[PDB]
A = this chain, B = another copy of it.
Amino acid sequence: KTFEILKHLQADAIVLFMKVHNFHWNVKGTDFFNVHKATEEIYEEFADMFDDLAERIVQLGHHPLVTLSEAIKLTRVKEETKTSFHSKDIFKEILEDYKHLEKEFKELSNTAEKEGDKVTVTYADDQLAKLQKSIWMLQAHLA
């Protein structure tokens, strides 16, 4: 079901919104400004992904998650409880979650195609493109 994948991805998106803010506030190192700036852009992307997933759910005639409580229940992303990081820790963690999201959007694309949902396929493949680009660049940071 396309709806089931979408709803779990919506949960992930708000959890990541929060996680990346953590990295944003609590990064240490001569690298601060770069990472602080980059994490800001990343959490804005998750805020947008969060809105988009929810509105696609609505367009499909279902209910998006509407509480942080549901988000916590439905997410596959582990919340980060540490409050201090250097650039390499942050980029490693975001990479791991991106790889998770990438597999989820591959499934989204495949599932929506089976169900003949052309619009969700287009959305999934577009997110896939953004994720695969970011994945490379993050891997490049860590090499």
A binding-site residues for B, Cβ under 8 Å: 14-15, 18-19, 21-22, 24-34, 36, 38, 47, 50-51, 54-55, 58-59, 63-64, 66-69, 71-72, 79-84, 87-88, 91, 106, 109, 118-119, 121-126, 128-129, 132-133, 135-137, 140-141, 143
- A30's nearest neighbour on chain B, judged by CB, is B87
- A62's nearest neighbour on chain B, judged by CB, is B83
Chain B residue contacts of A34, Cβ below 8 A: 33-34
Q: Is the CB of B66 within 8 A of A14?
A: no
- A122's nearest neighbour on chain B, judged by CB, is B125
The winner among A47, A64, A136 for most chain B CB atoms within 10 A is A136
State the number of copies, please: 12
Complex CA distance for A137 and B122, rounded to whole angstroms: 20
Chain B residue contacts of A24, Cβ below 8 A: 51
